[PDB]
Amino acid sequence: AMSLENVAFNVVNKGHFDGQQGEVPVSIINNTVYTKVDGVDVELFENKTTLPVNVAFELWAKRNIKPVPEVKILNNLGVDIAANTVIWDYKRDAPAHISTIGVCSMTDIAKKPTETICAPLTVFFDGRVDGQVDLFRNARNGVLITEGSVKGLQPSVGPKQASLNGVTLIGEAVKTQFNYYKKVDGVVQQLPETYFTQSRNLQEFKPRSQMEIDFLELAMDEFIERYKLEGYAFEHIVYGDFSHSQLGGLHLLIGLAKRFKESPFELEDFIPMDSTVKNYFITDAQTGSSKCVCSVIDLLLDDFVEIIKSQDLSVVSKVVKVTIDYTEISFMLWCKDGHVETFYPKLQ
Amino acid sequence: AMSLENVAFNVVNKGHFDGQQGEVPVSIINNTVYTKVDGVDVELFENKTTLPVNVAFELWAKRNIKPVPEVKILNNLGVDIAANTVIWDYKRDAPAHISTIGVCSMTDIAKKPTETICAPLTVFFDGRVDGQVDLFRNARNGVLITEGSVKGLQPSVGPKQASLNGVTLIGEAVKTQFNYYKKVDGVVQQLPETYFTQSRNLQEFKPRSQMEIDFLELAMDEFIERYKLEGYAFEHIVYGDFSHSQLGGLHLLIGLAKRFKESPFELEDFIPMDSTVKNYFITDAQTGSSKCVCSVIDLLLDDFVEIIKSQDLSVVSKVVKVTIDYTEISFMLWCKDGHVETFYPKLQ
Amino acid sequence: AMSLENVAFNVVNKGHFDGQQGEVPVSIINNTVYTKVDGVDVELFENKTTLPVNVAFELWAKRNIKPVPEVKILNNLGVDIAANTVIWDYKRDAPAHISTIGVCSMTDIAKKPTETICAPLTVFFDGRVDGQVDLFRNARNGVLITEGSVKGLQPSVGPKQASLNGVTLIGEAVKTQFNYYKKVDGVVQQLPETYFTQSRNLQEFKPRSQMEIDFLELAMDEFIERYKLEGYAFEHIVYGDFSHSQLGGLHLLIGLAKRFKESPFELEDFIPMDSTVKNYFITDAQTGSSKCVCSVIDLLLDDFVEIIKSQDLSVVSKVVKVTIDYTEISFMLWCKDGHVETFYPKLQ
Amino acid sequence: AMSLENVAFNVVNKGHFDGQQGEVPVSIINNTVYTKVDGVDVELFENKTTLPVNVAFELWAKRNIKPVPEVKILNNLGVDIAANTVIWDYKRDAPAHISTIGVCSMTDIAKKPTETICAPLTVFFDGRVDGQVDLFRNARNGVLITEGSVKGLQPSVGPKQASLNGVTLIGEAVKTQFNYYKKVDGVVQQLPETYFTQSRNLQEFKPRSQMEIDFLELAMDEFIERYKLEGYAFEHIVYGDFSHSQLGGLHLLIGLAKRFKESPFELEDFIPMDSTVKNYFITDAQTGSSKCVCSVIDLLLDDFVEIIKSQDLSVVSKVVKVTIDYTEISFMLWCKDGHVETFYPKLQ
Amino acid sequence: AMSLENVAFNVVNKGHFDGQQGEVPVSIINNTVYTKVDGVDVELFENKTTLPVNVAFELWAKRNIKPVPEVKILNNLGVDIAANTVIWDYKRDAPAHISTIGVCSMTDIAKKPTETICAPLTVFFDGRVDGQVDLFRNARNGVLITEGSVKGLQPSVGPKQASLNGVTLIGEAVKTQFNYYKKVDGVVQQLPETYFTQSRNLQEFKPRSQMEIDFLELAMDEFIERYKLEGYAFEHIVYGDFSHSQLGGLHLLIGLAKRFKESPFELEDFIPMDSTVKNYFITDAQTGSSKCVCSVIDLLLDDFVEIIKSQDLSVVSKVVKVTIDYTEISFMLWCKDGHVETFYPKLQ
Ligand SMILES: NCCCc1ncc[nH]1
Ligand SMILES: NCCCc1ncc[nH]1
Structure with a gap:
């Protein structure tokens, strides 16, 4: 016998829906579910969904834990x-x-x-x-x-x-x-054969390989030299270019994490959802360099190096497709004289 | 085991809360309770109260029938x-x-x-x-x-x-x-000994005595003559005076019902609740005569005649207290030369 | 190119969505769509649905006319x-x-x-x-x-x-x-072969046969005599019994329309949607006789007479299934000594 | 010293804002203003405007009376x-x-x-x-x-x-x-010199000339004969044509009022505001004849007859500008062989 | 003379209600109070209570400072x-x-x-x-x-x-x-004689005794040895066990603060109110060890040691009642062979 009061009882006593019998007094106001605890209303849930408040509350209580x-x-x-x-x-x-x-x-x-x-x-x-x-x-x-x-x-x-x-x-x-x-x-x-994104956060980014430890610790020119990355435009793509009004490159999460330790920046998550590639409107606080749509992917640096080193660098521009998280991600690869100029997850 | 879904089941199947077991799916959005009936949402209740929607719905379902x-x-x-x-x-x-x-x-x-x-x-x-x-x-x-x-x-x-x-x-x-x-x-x-208001509507007003039948059928001067009401200002108090910009008298519901048959008027119920004496902002559509606070009481015309004929008419102005619906209702009585000028439920 | 502004342009200029090009300024606040008409906001639509306001507005504008x-x-x-x-x-x-x-x-x-x-x-x-x-x-x-x-x-x-x-x-x-x-x-x-409900209103009910004209004009005992309806409990089922606290019968719309001419009553439509059989919480204003769930169907009186006269009256109680509006409607038929006691759309 | 509580005090005691000193407790919830009257909340105002509820309440209280x-x-x-x-x-x-x-x-x-x-x-x-x-x-x-x-x-x-x-x-x-x-x-x-609209309602329409009394009482062919209106298409323009799926003419309020006495119809006021010319989505209930945009103007029939009889009927189609309520109203006039086919307020 | 505008004036000029005379323009929209500051609306208060917005705003302005x-x-x-x-x-x-x-x-x-x-x-x-x-x-x-x-x-x-x-x-x-x-x-x-909770935060936790300084600085086995806590299950109860899918123990705030310095975790405060014992749905970010209802109390470690060392350890399970913050808190004490297995504030 499902009920709003029984769902709220489960949330209050079990931390989530646990199939327990019981009921608590509930009040619904606007998009918030409250319960009375010793005479006063205490908020149990604020509906941020497009479903009715009592329905979203039940689905949230019944979430997979x-x-x-x-x-x-x-x-x-x-x-x-x-x-x-x-x-x-x-x-x-x-x-x-x-x-x-x-x-x-x-x-x-x-x-x-x-x-x-x-x-x-x-x-x-x-x-x-x-x-x-x-x-x-x-x-x-x-x-x-x-x-x-x-x-x-x-x-x-x-x-x-x-x-x-x-x-x-x-x-x-x-x-x-x-x-x-x-x-x-x-x-x-x-x-299909696939790479996987690493799902890391900017503030608590941790390296997951010796190459990633070296990226975070070494200076740009030392790292590029150690891993023979000359001509692959890591200066632009991974480290980021904050010298012009438009922020250049900065498409790999590890590069944003390195920048973040030195100086902060704003990342506007204008389509806030889970996705293999994320788009941010970034504003660098130190320089004022910014970009409306900065596509960012969190790949293990070794996987990104393997992908970029497995491409033909003989054409001005082309689409490079890479299976990542089981989906086909399109990257735009721009080259000049046999060297990479930029490589980024396509804003299509 | 009380629940929103059980209350809604009772409303859907019994027309109100009847202590029956069962549940129907419910959705709450804003101040409205809906239930799913064969795939679509059907409104069960719109909350017009200051209580939370699910609480008002339950009290309304549990109303005394x-x-x-x-x-x-x-x-x-x-x-x-x-x-x-x-x-x-x-x-x-x-x-x-x-x-x-x-x-x-x-x-x-x-x-x-x-x-x-x-x-x-x-x-x-x-x-x-x-x-x-x-x-x-x-x-x-x-x-x-x-x-x-x-x-x-x-x-x-x-x-x-x-x-x-x-x-x-x-x-x-x-x-x-x-x-x-x-x-x-x-x-x-x-x-206390009390009169009672009659609780009638303007649109479906029915007389409840021979005097009330005569008021509605007879012309003003012949009703006043038949019931020996000369000097009691019924022309002003009961019939109403629509000759000046401020509407005069019109404090008895029966007088409003008589006027209503001839020509319509607006009654703005600016404090909409049940009360022995009601206050309306009235606008007469035919003349444009109006009054911001027109106190109106629905007494049986015989009771109103008994009240007004039981007063001493020797003072310019005084408060006359009359028990109606168990409450003391203050009336303002204005006299001149032994005749009534006006008599109305005193605006507190 | 569908848009909120284009839908509103069509509503303002064409009375509904008509595929016309153009845009009007719109403002959405709460569940209402407004448009600016010479400096002020004018309401175009109030959302009474469980869909988002702009979506319901578009579906309503695109309604079949x-x-x-x-x-x-x-x-x-x-x-x-x-x-x-x-x-x-x-x-x-x-x-x-x-x-x-x-x-x-x-x-x-x-x-x-x-x-x-x-x-x-x-x-x-x-x-x-x-x-x-x-x-x-x-x-x-x-x-x-x-x-x-x-x-x-x-x-x-x-x-x-x-x-x-x-x-x-x-x-x-x-x-x-x-x-x-x-x-x-x-x-x-x-x-299947089916009867059809007549879809009439109580306030503007019109007869659609000589039998229906006779029902509305003739007195109860002379209509029952003219159509040989003795023993079919039309006194209870169709005319209604207002003598006890529980209102008896009154399951045919024509009977409610006849009662309505004599005296008013409240019909609480507690599941307000379109259906072959409607359930109302009825309160008769003259007597105070009431019923929480009064099932009401608008069949042509001739069709109802044909249905009730085609039943075997030898059992105390039984379910009679009748196809109406393409659906099987269950009726409860109660008999005693070869005569009908009651016949009503079975409350599921 | 203006205040929400003082505005509410004035509404409760004076029926509107009257500059009186005093305060009543108020509660605002959603778009409604309530006041406490002996323990319970009573609604004083429901905001239907695009302004904040407390601001609209004050403007409404301060309305010109x-x-x-x-x-x-x-x-x-x-x-x-x-x-x-x-x-x-x-x-x-x-x-x-x-x-x-x-x-x-x-x-x-x-x-x-x-x-x-x-x-x-x-x-x-x-x-x-x-x-x-x-x-x-x-x-x-x-x-x-x-x-x-x-x-x-x-x-x-x-x-x-x-x-x-x-x-x-x-x-x-x-x-x-x-x-x-x-x-x-x-x-x-x-x-400018102007005609004025009469501002009448359909349900309580009253004639304001002998010609209007004759329009409402006389049959179509005898009214047209009496006022020598042959060739002016009053059959279409004023009486209305309910014979085809698209409702023909019916642009004068008096014609809608005449039709209304015989049989009802739906008038969808899809831009609900005050205007010299109104547009309705009309559905005739008797015939099913309908029109998405039926422009309707309430002119005194004599004024409409004067306007239509003052036009040159020698061209197939043309715009006729008429000053009504101080505004230039465009009319579309369609003629054939020296007779009017239609004349209507031009749909802008 | 209390008023919404006067309360807002006090908030704007005095930081709270200070009995000062004056008024500012206010607008109420949904559950937010705004004031006009040089032509634009500035938010003064967002109602998170179940009271009407203007009433909650006044009580918040009148809070004890x-x-x-x-x-x-x-x-x-x-x-x-x-x-x-x-x-x-x-x-x-x-x-x-x-x-x-x-x-x-x-x-x-x-x-x-x-x-x-x-x-x-x-x-x-x-x-x-x-x-x-x-x-x-x-x-x-x-x-x-x-x-x-x-x-x-x-x-x-x-x-x-x-x-x-x-x-x-x-x-x-x-x-x-x-x-x-x-x-x-x-x-x-x-x-009654009572212990008091310390009301500390996880992020800014400060020790309040030498034992608490030692708990935070020393390794688990050194601290347990120094304070002779062998057999009291501090490894489980205070330090926490992150080795199984269900997080073990972790019922004392000091233990959560120690864990927090090493690695972060999520604490879902599913009944957000002030209480002597708090319940959290905890997810350890490093291990994935989690618990739906982890009761947590912030007692001074010395007080918790005194409480646990004052119990009889001879029964499998029993309720231990301790007055804390003037209320009776029930703890569940589980023992085996004269040693503690667990001791936690009862999730009753
Ligand atoms: N949160 C209010 C507690 C008041 C109370 N205690 C016991 C009864 N009522
Ligand atoms: N977010 C849901 C995706 C479901 C889907 N994939 C393809 C079609 N539908």
Whole structure:
């Protein structure tokens, strides 16, 4: 027996929806859910979604609290809906998916993913839940994650990191690296070879290779010399050029993290959502150098070096396609006299 | 187990809260409660109260659906709260009382009127509900209504009419005339002798005596002659004077109803609530004669004639107090040479 | 190039969306759309839907302005969505369907009904629009209306009335009687033989047969005598019993219209939407007789007489299923000694 | 000392702002102003304007309660703002003008119309207020109304009717016919000779000449014969043609009032404001004949007959400009063989 | 003469309500109060309370700006209301109490605490205000704070810290340590022996004893050895166990502060209010170890050591009650073979 008061009871006593019986007094005002605690109203939830406040509150309470794939991975794999869970999108403060299956009476399109309404949708299945590997085997369209091997199915090793309650982390106490599987029209897909973005933050950026440690510690000319990067325009692309009114390059998160230690800058996240490539309106506070659309990707510096060193540098401009997070990312590569001028994730 | 979904289930299936088990999906957006009916949202309630939308919806669903005293009578008797019911104020589209007793977890100050918090409040008790006469006997402060005799308790015969689902009526299939009782500080109070307002509408006004039939049918000068009303200023007070920019008199509802048949006028109800005396900003459409504060009372014309004919007409101006609906209504009486000039409910 | 300003330009200059080029300044505040007219804001639309204000405004502007089936008929036939039009539900002040096809970028699930997303949905097709009969022939699920014969397709003669801009009418200058067709899972479905509700209002009720003229003019006992209705409980079912606290019978709109001429009553439409059977919380103003859930259906009195006279009256209680507006309506029939006690649309 | 609480005190005790000292407790929630009356909240004002709720409440409380020109006349004369008053637009439930002069601290652009900010604005002045004729004489731009002669100023006799608290009326107890004067760039402007619209409603339409009495009582062919209107297409223009899907003509309010007595129709006022010519999306309920943009003007039938009989009928199509309510109204006149086919206020 | 404009004038010129005369222009939009400063709107207050925006703005302006007891202390002492002040709850951004006494006309239940409505309520009295010690002496129910001795009354030494404008601090320039007194039904209570929580923040945690300095500086095994804490499960309870998917222990704020220096973690404050024990949904960013309901108390480590070393360790599980901040806190104590396994504030 689902109810607003029961959802609020679960949030108050269990920190989230935990199927417990009970009710607390609730008041809804505008887009906020409150509960009465000893005579006064205490805020439980502020709706930042486009769904009705009581519906968003229920989906948020019913969010998956285990490490789950980051929303950008699910989106890149064409995931439409999740089987009997809510993947909460912490970047948008909203459900990752419009509809649900066996979660909430207002958003449910089905109670089980075997209902014919789900057959054309790519349903997310989680092998850590009993019966979901079997549901994926019988589903026409779906994406499955598992911690280990699935008999007969060939896996795709996913990223090392996963999202746990909005914290992206590489699990030590929990497993965050999943095997991925995908089916389109009843046929198990062969997921492509892919690089993965590292999902790091600017303020707490940590290197994940000796090359990344060297990038952060060494001076620009020492690093470029050590890794034989002359002619690859890392001065522009990675370090950034703050000498003109338009900020040059600065498309790799590691370069922004290095700059951030020396001096701050504003990053306007004008489309705030999870995506493989992010676009920011950047203003460098020290110089006043700025760029309306600065595309930024967090690749491991070694992967970015491998990508740029695997390109033909004989044409003025061309599109370089790279599978990253299972999706095809277009980069614009500009060359002159056999050397790179710029290389950036395409603002298409 | 009270819940928003259960309240909505009761509204959808029973027309109001009826203690039935069940749930319907609900969505709350802004101040409106909706339910899903075959794929689309259907409005169940629009909150016009100052309470949270889900709380007002529950109180409205739990409204008393038996004939109950009109809110003006309850207000006049000093009723603060009701015992285990909601008196819905249809004139304000809101609960008649801020708090509840044994109704709703958000508004309840107690579950039973015997709780010490209720002792200073004048609690409304309904003798038609088992145990409520006994609860009145043990209450420090309260107002009780009954359909019959209570042993040892001296009654006050209330008005003929009561409100049933917002319709004021004199019951034929149901009893609407109640005995009234009141207690203050543990002591039974003698309710005063009183007139009662008739609670009629302008558009569907019906006469309730031969004098009222004669007022509506006869011309002004022949009605005044027939009932020997010369010198009582009925021309001004009751018929109304539309000859000057300021509308003169027009303080009896019957006079407004007579005028309404001939020509329309605007009545701005600038304090829209139930009260013994109503104030309107009136604009006569035919003449343009208007008055910002025109006090209007719906007394039976015979009662108004009895009141005005029982006054001493020897002083220029004085306050005449008349008990109406259990409250002392102040009237301003203006005389000249032994005749009335005006008589109106005194604008406080 | 669709835009809020272009939609508002069309509303201001064409009375609705008419595909015209142009823009007017618009301001959105809360749930209302305004436009500037010579310096001041003028309201164009107040959103009463659960969709975003600018989206609801666009769907309302793009509403079908030809006579279309009443929403209750579309709901009864299982219509989920319309092909390249918006059926505006004037009873709910909202789109009849959640999603659109080729109408609005925010609500569209497809641009054409041939897209695979539309295959499981019952799409409404209108033969008066070029190519829509062909689209119905190729659709997996759908309901089609036409003004004439479709080769090889067996028709179902629909109701005489249709809705034109929220006015239900039997067209004289326009055709409102359509042929109906339906497909389920790619297979043309035979629509059942059905009665149709008359879609009349209480305040402007007009008789549509000599029996209905006689019901409204004749006294109860002489109408029952003239039409040999003794033993069919029309006194209870149709005329209504206002003698007890619970209002008895009163399930036919014509009986409510007859009562309405004599004395008024309140009809609380607690689920305000279009449906074959309506439920009202009724309070009779004259007697105080009331009923929380009074099911009411507007059948032609002759059709109701035909239905009730075609039943076996030998059992205490039973369910009688009658096809009305293409839906199976359950009725509860209560008998005693070979006579009817009551017959009413069964409260589900 | 202006304040929200003082404005509310004035509304509660005086029916509007009357400069009285005092305060009442107020609560603002969403767009509604409430006051506490014996423990419960009572609604004083619901903001339907695009201004902040407390600001709109103050302007509405400070509305002019004397007969004032109808907003369409003020708009037609180019009035931007009023001197030390608020002209409340009852058709829009909003101030007729965005800014104020000496009324409200939030909307004031000046305290007196002599401030240089008012020089480019056409300020409305009211000769019934002391000093306002002198203020008009010194204003660069303005419109003045008076009840009598202003020395040396040539007057324009305005309409017979004025708006008093939202009621348009021809005053008997008050004067509603004003002399009008206008200044542009410091120069007194000669107001043109004009017809005036009658400002009548469909439901309470009253004839104002013997020709109008004859139009409403006589049959179409005998009225046309009596007034020698053969060849002037009154059958189409005034009576209306309900025979085709598109409703023909019906551009004079009197014709809509005649039709209304026989059968109802829907008039969608899609730009709800006061204007000389109104546009409606009309749906005739009896026939289903409809028109998205039906321009309607309320001229005295005699004035419309005078206008149409003063035109040259020798050209297929042409624009006929007629001064109505001080504005040039364009009409489209279509002729064939020396007879009128149609004549309507040209849809701009 | 209280008013919205006067409250706003005080906020603009005095930083809070200071009883100064004056008015500023104000606009209210949604839940925000603005004032016009040289032509533009400037935000003064955003309502995060469940009260009307203008009422919450007034109570916030009238907040107590002296050091006052933290809301958790007032709540633990059963405080219902304050005498002639507003205790602003900075953790909820709302008044600590629903009603007021002599503060605001919308929330006042009385002007003075001697009114009979206040007699059953526990009124907060402040000895720093003239006459409030005497008001406490005559009150039936109340809590009094003083800086020094009250003749005849025995004091309870309160916490060292108090809240000054939402900053919890141990005053050096001001006195924050108060004597507490409480009366229930006219009887001066003997307040129990109690520990006090330290009200520290995670980010700016400072040790308040040599044991706390040693906890933060020393390694886990060195500290446990130095203070002879073997067998008391400090490894689990205080340091925290981040090795399993469920985060173990971590119930003392000092342990969270130590962890915070090494690596960050998310603390979801799902019931955001002031309380002796706080519950957080914690996610450790380094390991991914998490716990839905991690109860956390900020006790001085010496007090926690004294509490845990004063328990009988011979039973598997039992409830240990400890008076903290004047309230009874239940702890769950789990033992095995004479050693502690866990000890935590009970999630009841
Ligand atoms: N954000 C949801 C993506 C779902 C999808 N992918 C392709 C089509 N639909
Ligand atoms: N948060 C207010 C507490 C007041 C109280 N304590 C006990 C009863 N009421």
